[PDB]
Amino acid sequence: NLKIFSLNSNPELAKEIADIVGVQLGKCSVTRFSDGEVQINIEESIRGCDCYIIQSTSDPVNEHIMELLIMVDALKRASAKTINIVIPYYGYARQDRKARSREPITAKLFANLLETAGATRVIALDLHAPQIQGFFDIPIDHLMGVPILGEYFEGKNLEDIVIVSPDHGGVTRARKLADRLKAPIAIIDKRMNIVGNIEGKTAILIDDIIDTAGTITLAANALVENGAKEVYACCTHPVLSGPAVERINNSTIKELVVTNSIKLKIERFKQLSVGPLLAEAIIRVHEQQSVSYLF
Amino acid sequence: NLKIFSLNSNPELAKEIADIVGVQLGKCSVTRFSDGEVQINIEESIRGCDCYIIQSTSDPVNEHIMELLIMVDALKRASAKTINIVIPYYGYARQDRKARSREPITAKLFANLLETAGATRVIALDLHAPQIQGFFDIPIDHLMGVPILGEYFEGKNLEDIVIVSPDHGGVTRARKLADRLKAPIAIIDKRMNIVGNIEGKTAILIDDIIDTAGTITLAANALVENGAKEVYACCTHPVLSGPAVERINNSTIKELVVTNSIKLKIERFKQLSVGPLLAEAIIRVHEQQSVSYLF
Ligand SMILES: Nc1ncnc2c1ncn2[C@@H]1O[C@H](COP(=O)(O)CP(=O)(O)O)[C@@H](O)[C@H]1O
Ligand SMILES: Nc1ncnc2c1ncn2[C@@H]1O[C@H](COP(=O)(O)CP(=O)(O)O)[C@@H](O)[C@H]1O
Ligand SMILES: CP(=O)(O)OC[C@H]1O[C@@H](n2cnc3c(N)ncnc32)[C@H](O)[C@@H]1O
Ligand SMILES: CP(=O)(O)OC[C@H]1O[C@@H](n2cnc3c(N)ncnc32)[C@H](O)[C@@H]1O
Incomplete structure (x- = not known):
């Protein structure tokens, strides 16, 4: 058995x-x-x-x-x-x-x-x-794990979303989430430019792993600065090492959504x-x- | 020996x-x-x-x-x-x-x-x-192979360039070429949208393999329709099978640049x-x- x-x-x-x-x-x-x-x-x-x-x-x-x-x-x-x-x-x-x-x-x-x-x-x-x-x-x-993160956001009844890839190698992922929510994508092009229309939209930042949170928090604040209405962030694996929590808590991220693939305090989060x-x-x-x- | x-x-x-x-x-x-x-x-x-x-x-x-x-x-x-x-x-x-x-x-x-x-x-x-x-x-x-294609474009004295990725999985590559040419990037988001500013710019489409040319030619014409001054296309491996040549020859691609990693009649091409x-x-x-x- x-x-x-x-x-x-x-x-x-x-x-x-x-x-x-x-x-x-x-x-x-x-x-x-x-x-x-x-x-x-x-x-x-x-x-x-x-x-x-x-x-x-x-x-x-x-x-x-x-x-x-x-x-x-x-x-x-x-x-x-x-x-x-x-x-x-x-x-x-x-x-x-x-x-x-x-x-x-x-x-x-x-x-x-x-x-x-x-x-x-x-x-x-x-x-x-x-x-x-x-x-x-x-x-x-x-x-x-995207279908799991997708279902949660769909249940939030959001309007005017744009899925944002925090860097060049995450565009495919961003696209799988955009597909499920029937939304556009924008990408952060750091050499920190923003390629895509994020003006007045609810931006959802998605990455596979969130480790130190440098890129992600940095990307959030810049999303807001450039006109986004609000920023959500999600990943499958919450490595969150170093000053991650410190950084997330202090950012403009409305809610950090992660899964329990890794065992874990964050103020605005949700573990699926x-x-x-x-x-x-x-x-x-x-x-x-x-x-x-x-x- | x-x-x-x-x-x-x-x-x-x-x-x-x-x-x-x-x-x-x-x-x-x-x-x-x-x-x-x-x-x-x-x-x-x-x-x-x-x-x-x-x-x-x-x-x-x-x-x-x-x-x-x-x-x-x-x-x-x-x-x-x-x-x-x-x-x-x-x-x-x-x-x-x-x-x-x-x-x-x-x-x-x-x-x-x-x-x-x-x-x-x-x-x-x-x-x-x-x-x-x-x-x-x-x-x-x-x-x-990018450094080889990059050297050849720098010799074109093209101004106002934008490097364009023909799909989601090619953004990293596009970025290595942009870095070289200190230029911006835009991406084709086909579900056929264009994410990025390509208005009045010389667009360089780059992919690793050019096989049937469906996506690439299709992307070219759309680049032009949306305001690009001219479109170049390059890849490392010229598989060019099926109706590729047919399609390339009839597109708005100014010049197709490839390497001789694969043995090859195209009108506007250059083999490095x-x-x-x-x-x-x-x-x-x-x-x-x-x-x-x-x-
Ligand atoms: N749509 C999908 N997205 C990505 N890969 C998938 C998907 N459908 C199947 N696969 C891949 O195929 C694997 C499982 O398929 P298999 O075991 O070959 C066949 P079976 O359907 O008999 O289980 C998955 O682990 C995944 O790697
Ligand atoms: N700048 C880089 N970009 C990509 N690959 C690189 C880079 N630097 C080195 N490499 C990798 O390292 C390999 C060659 O170096 P190694 O054999 O590790 C060491 P050595 O320089 O002693 O030959 C390359 O084939 C490549 O895979
Ligand atoms: C953006 P990427 O191409 O998905 O990231 C890969 C790079 O991160 C580095 N890397 C490997 N393990 C790492 C880890 N645990 N923490 C940080 N970076 C890591 C590798 O050296 C590699 O250059
Ligand atoms: C651009 P990609 O996301 O790396 O494309 C991967 C897919 O292209 C297809 N592929 C594999 N062999 C190929 C070939 N020689 N001709 C065309 N597409 C190929 C397969 O469907 C594979 O899942």
Whole structure:
């Protein structure tokens, strides 16, 4: 049958996914010996079971990566039938090529590591570059989070919107959101110009990851300065490190909308859940049903 | 110790490169048996030599891919020291992810095939997606073509330029060319809107591949209709299949600028050579000098 294990990155999301699915989370202690080495106890036999491990490789990234790899090894040697990795947030996704000399392509190395450890398949959400799906030779399902952010805004009954991409590489994303809301797009062209008509419109800034918030807050204020009626901001993954919160709270962003792909105070925010989406992906993968239906 | 072989895709480019490097192309004939199967005769012993093969996997793509793989196999079994692949145009680079269900990720399979056949390293030019560099675990150098197209436009003394991206996924590229030309950018948003000020400006349309020319010609005419003084168009790889030439010749494109990464009658065009760029790269790879010196 189906066993779901949660590691340490996002226990809540895991529990939420297990409940939506209708099963109790797997019994296992994933602790740390006194020396910081990862210790793993899977307290119930799992021979012949299909295991799903839920882990975001978010802060601290290297610890979550290692306890994930170590867990995969434990399951492989314990005879799991399949070892399915559910990764709500894929750390290192941004290092997807040699942008400069002698740089590692970490997203690819992670992929090689996971396969070497023994992973059977991966279920990922809003990967920074969709080409990362090709970094694996094991099956990998890539879910989009935009439909979730889109539904929330549509329910706000907004009028006169313009979807804004905070930089050059986010235009495709901005376009997927514009499509769903039947709206135009404008882009921030920082060398900080604004390409597109944002005058008197409700601007929605969308990015995949919101990390330090420099570009996003900087872009918001400039949207307002240039005539936008109000600015909303959203992303799938709330990394929010450094002075992010500080910056967001002090900006002109009316509301920051994020998902719980990463565990988290912000004054004007709203966290949407990707629990239902992942749970449903899990069931379909497990009942061998079409996943394309989720798109 | 250095030997360069040309396969059938682009003999001219290969000879040009060898002339710059100063070697005579290696002795081998790649022909067809009466039934269509590749026959490969390597006329000289290459034991211990560093072999570089020059092949674009352009039309007919599957034939060029097979003769390349078969050549790699011949070299491997003939004891080449290294087998270095110079790919000016990487066919199948557009299938870099699962954009819709049950699709293959061909760019990745090609990479897996090349390594399986025995490739040591790859030198590629303007890959459709830079992440394709991470599809390999063998070393791969990714040369850029924009600087070549940029130099040629600066020599036009065009004023009031705007670089235009023909769609959402080409904005980063458009930006690298704008940076060069210290110019602004506009983008075509087809659901066919134009986001950006193109009124009375010389518009330069830039894409990586120009295949059927539907989007590009369609974008040109719309640029003109909306107030652009004149439109130029450029790309690195001239696939130009189908009714491309037909369409280009009949459009308002003042001049189509391409490179010779792919072998080619167009009325207003200009072909620039990537021969010098690839040749210097081969020399630096063989000598183990810095390749990043070239960027
Ligand atoms: N419209 C979509 N947007 C983006 N990619 C999608 C969409 N539809 C399907 N895909 C891709 O196809 C994958 C799932 O499809 P498959 O498992 O091949 C087929 P099945 O429909 O049998 O599950 C997803 O993980 C995603 O990568
Ligand atoms: N400015 C840059 N733009 C794009 N790619 C670059 C840049 N700098 C270096 N690279 C990457 O680094 C590769 C070449 O440098 P490396 O082999 O890492 C180091 P070396 O300079 O020692 O050769 C290129 O093929 C390219 O992928
Ligand atoms: C705008 P992009 O092209 O999507 O961003 C990729 C760049 O960000 C850098 N990057 C990688 N990991 C990072 C991280 N965790 N924080 C900040 N930037 C990162 C990479 O070196 C790469 O040059
Ligand atoms: C510009 P893009 O968003 O990178 O385009 C990717 C899509 O173009 C298509 N594509 C793949 N191979 C191609 C080919 N040789 N001819 C035309 N389009 C191709 C596929 O439908 C793929 O999902």
